[PDB]
Amino acid sequence: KNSFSLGENPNANP
């Protein structure tokens, strides 16, 4: 079972 890497966008990013 391949674990997917979540790309979370930074707090208050322009």
Side-chain angles (χ1 to χ4, degrees):
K1 189 177 68 67
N2 285 262
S3 186
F4 186 82
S5 185
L6 290 173
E8 302 297 272
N9 186 264
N11 80 263
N13 185 264

PDB file of all heavy atoms in Angstrom:
ATOM      1  N   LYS A   1       0.865  -1.200   0.000  1.00  0.00           N
ATOM      2  CA  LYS A   1       0.000   0.000   0.000  1.00  0.00           C
ATOM      3  C   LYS A   1       0.908   1.259   0.000  1.00  0.00           C
ATOM      4  O   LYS A   1       1.584   1.552   0.994  1.00  0.00           O
ATOM      5  CB  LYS A   1      -0.981  -0.065   1.199  1.00  0.00           C
ATOM      6  CG  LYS A   1      -2.077   1.028   1.192  1.00  0.00           C
ATOM      7  CD  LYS A   1      -3.104   0.929   2.343  1.00  0.00           C
ATOM      8  CE  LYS A   1      -2.584   1.208   3.770  1.00  0.00           C
ATOM      9  NZ  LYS A   1      -2.168   2.608   3.980  1.00  0.00           N
ATOM     10  N   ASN A   2       0.898   2.006  -1.121  1.00  0.00           N
ATOM     11  CA  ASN A   2       1.761   3.196  -1.317  1.00  0.00           C
ATOM     12  C   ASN A   2       1.126   4.448  -0.648  1.00  0.00           C
ATOM     13  O   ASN A   2       0.023   4.869  -1.014  1.00  0.00           O
ATOM     14  CB  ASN A   2       2.026   3.451  -2.830  1.00  0.00           C
ATOM     15  CG  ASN A   2       3.029   2.493  -3.505  1.00  0.00           C
ATOM     16  OD1 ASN A   2       4.206   2.810  -3.673  1.00  0.00           O
ATOM     17  ND2 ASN A   2       2.585   1.311  -3.906  1.00  0.00           N
ATOM     18  N   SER A   3       1.854   5.044   0.315  1.00  0.00           N
ATOM     19  CA  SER A   3       1.398   6.243   1.053  1.00  0.00           C
ATOM     20  C   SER A   3       1.590   7.547   0.226  1.00  0.00           C
ATOM     21  O   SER A   3       2.715   7.896  -0.147  1.00  0.00           O
ATOM     22  CB  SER A   3       2.101   6.304   2.415  1.00  0.00           C
ATOM     23  OG  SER A   3       1.588   7.363   3.217  1.00  0.00           O
ATOM     24  N   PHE A   4       0.478   8.262  -0.029  1.00  0.00           N
ATOM     25  CA  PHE A   4       0.484   9.526  -0.804  1.00  0.00           C
ATOM     26  C   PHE A   4       0.986  10.729   0.050  1.00  0.00           C
ATOM     27  O   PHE A   4       0.469  10.993   1.141  1.00  0.00           O
ATOM     28  CB  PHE A   4      -0.917   9.769  -1.414  1.00  0.00           C
ATOM     29  CG  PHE A   4      -1.033  10.982  -2.362  1.00  0.00           C
ATOM     30  CD1 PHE A   4      -0.635  10.876  -3.699  1.00  0.00           C
ATOM     31  CD2 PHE A   4      -1.483  12.216  -1.876  1.00  0.00           C
ATOM     32  CE1 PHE A   4      -0.682  11.988  -4.537  1.00  0.00           C
ATOM     33  CE2 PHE A   4      -1.525  13.327  -2.714  1.00  0.00           C
ATOM     34  CZ  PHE A   4      -1.125  13.213  -4.043  1.00  0.00           C
ATOM     35  N   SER A   5       1.962  11.475  -0.502  1.00  0.00           N
ATOM     36  CA  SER A   5       2.527  12.678   0.143  1.00  0.00           C
ATOM     37  C   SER A   5       1.622  13.917  -0.113  1.00  0.00           C
ATOM     38  O   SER A   5       1.478  14.371  -1.254  1.00  0.00           O
ATOM     39  CB  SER A   5       3.974  12.887  -0.323  1.00  0.00           C
ATOM     40  OG  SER A   5       4.587  13.968   0.370  1.00  0.00           O
ATOM     41  N   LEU A   6       1.030  14.456   0.968  1.00  0.00           N
ATOM     42  CA  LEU A   6       0.137  15.634   0.911  1.00  0.00           C
ATOM     43  C   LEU A   6       0.950  16.957   0.841  1.00  0.00           C
ATOM     44  O   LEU A   6       1.758  17.247   1.732  1.00  0.00           O
ATOM     45  CB  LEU A   6      -0.827  15.649   2.128  1.00  0.00           C
ATOM     46  CG  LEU A   6      -1.942  14.557   2.164  1.00  0.00           C
ATOM     47  CD1 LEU A   6      -2.665  14.626   3.514  1.00  0.00           C
ATOM     48  CD2 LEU A   6      -2.955  14.696   1.013  1.00  0.00           C
ATOM     49  N   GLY A   7       0.707  17.753  -0.216  1.00  0.00           N
ATOM     50  CA  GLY A   7       1.370  19.066  -0.398  1.00  0.00           C
ATOM     51  C   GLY A   7       0.546  20.214   0.214  1.00  0.00           C
ATOM     52  O   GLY A   7      -0.205  20.887  -0.497  1.00  0.00           O
ATOM     53  N   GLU A   8       0.734  20.443   1.526  1.00  0.00           N
ATOM     54  CA  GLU A   8       0.023  21.499   2.286  1.00  0.00           C
ATOM     55  C   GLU A   8       0.628  22.907   2.026  1.00  0.00           C
ATOM     56  O   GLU A   8       1.830  23.125   2.222  1.00  0.00           O
ATOM     57  CB  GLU A   8       0.078  21.167   3.822  1.00  0.00           C
ATOM     58  CG  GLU A   8      -0.524  19.812   4.273  1.00  0.00           C
ATOM     59  CD  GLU A   8      -2.028  19.666   4.017  1.00  0.00           C
ATOM     60  OE1 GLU A   8      -2.890  20.034   4.815  1.00  0.00           O
ATOM     61  OE2 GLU A   8      -2.297  19.082   2.804  1.00  0.00           O
ATOM     62  N   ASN A   9      -0.228  23.858   1.606  1.00  0.00           N
ATOM     63  CA  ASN A   9       0.181  25.251   1.309  1.00  0.00           C
ATOM     64  C   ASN A   9       0.356  26.091   2.625  1.00  0.00           C
ATOM     65  O   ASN A   9      -0.615  26.178   3.386  1.00  0.00           O
ATOM     66  CB  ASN A   9      -0.859  25.885   0.342  1.00  0.00           C
ATOM     67  CG  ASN A   9      -0.505  27.295  -0.179  1.00  0.00           C
ATOM     68  OD1 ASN A   9      -0.948  28.303   0.372  1.00  0.00           O
ATOM     69  ND2 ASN A   9       0.292  27.400  -1.232  1.00  0.00           N
ATOM     70  N   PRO A  10       1.501  26.797   2.869  1.00  0.00           N
ATOM     71  CA  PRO A  10       1.767  27.605   4.059  1.00  0.00           C
ATOM     72  C   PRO A  10       0.696  28.593   4.595  1.00  0.00           C
ATOM     73  O   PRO A  10      -0.071  29.173   3.817  1.00  0.00           O
ATOM     74  CB  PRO A  10       3.133  28.253   3.805  1.00  0.00           C
ATOM     75  CG  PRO A  10       3.653  27.618   2.540  1.00  0.00           C
ATOM     76  CD  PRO A  10       2.846  26.355   2.502  1.00  0.00           C
ATOM     77  N   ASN A  11       0.696  28.803   5.929  1.00  0.00           N
ATOM     78  CA  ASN A  11      -0.229  29.749   6.611  1.00  0.00           C
ATOM     79  C   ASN A  11      -0.004  31.212   6.107  1.00  0.00           C
ATOM     80  O   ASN A  11       1.100  31.756   6.213  1.00  0.00           O
ATOM     81  CB  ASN A  11      -0.216  29.520   8.148  1.00  0.00           C
ATOM     82  CG  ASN A  11       0.937  30.119   8.971  1.00  0.00           C
ATOM     83  OD1 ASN A  11       1.926  29.465   9.302  1.00  0.00           O
ATOM     84  ND2 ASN A  11       0.792  31.389   9.296  1.00  0.00           N
ATOM     85  N   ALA A  12      -1.066  31.810   5.529  1.00  0.00           N
ATOM     86  CA  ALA A  12      -1.054  33.196   4.971  1.00  0.00           C
ATOM     87  C   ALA A  12      -0.027  33.410   3.799  1.00  0.00           C
ATOM     88  O   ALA A  12       0.672  34.428   3.746  1.00  0.00           O
ATOM     89  CB  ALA A  12      -0.916  34.250   6.120  1.00  0.00           C
ATOM     90  N   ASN A  13       0.024  32.459   2.835  1.00  0.00           N
ATOM     91  CA  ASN A  13       0.939  32.517   1.670  1.00  0.00           C
ATOM     92  C   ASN A  13       0.368  33.447   0.542  1.00  0.00           C
ATOM     93  O   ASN A  13      -0.785  33.235   0.150  1.00  0.00           O
ATOM     94  CB  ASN A  13       1.183  31.061   1.176  1.00  0.00           C
ATOM     95  CG  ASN A  13       2.217  30.902   0.043  1.00  0.00           C
ATOM     96  OD1 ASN A  13       1.866  30.840  -1.135  1.00  0.00           O
ATOM     97  ND2 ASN A  13       3.500  30.837   0.368  1.00  0.00           N
ATOM     98  N   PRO A  14       1.130  34.411  -0.059  1.00  0.00           N
ATOM     99  CA  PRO A  14       0.647  35.319  -1.121  1.00  0.00           C
ATOM    100  C   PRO A  14       0.123  34.654  -2.422  1.00  0.00           C
ATOM    101  O   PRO A  14       0.800  33.842  -3.055  1.00  0.00           O
ATOM    102  CB  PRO A  14       1.777  36.320  -1.363  1.00  0.00           C
ATOM    103  CG  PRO A  14       2.949  35.727  -0.649  1.00  0.00           C
ATOM    104  CD  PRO A  14       2.353  34.979   0.509  1.00  0.00           C
TER     105      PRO A  14
END
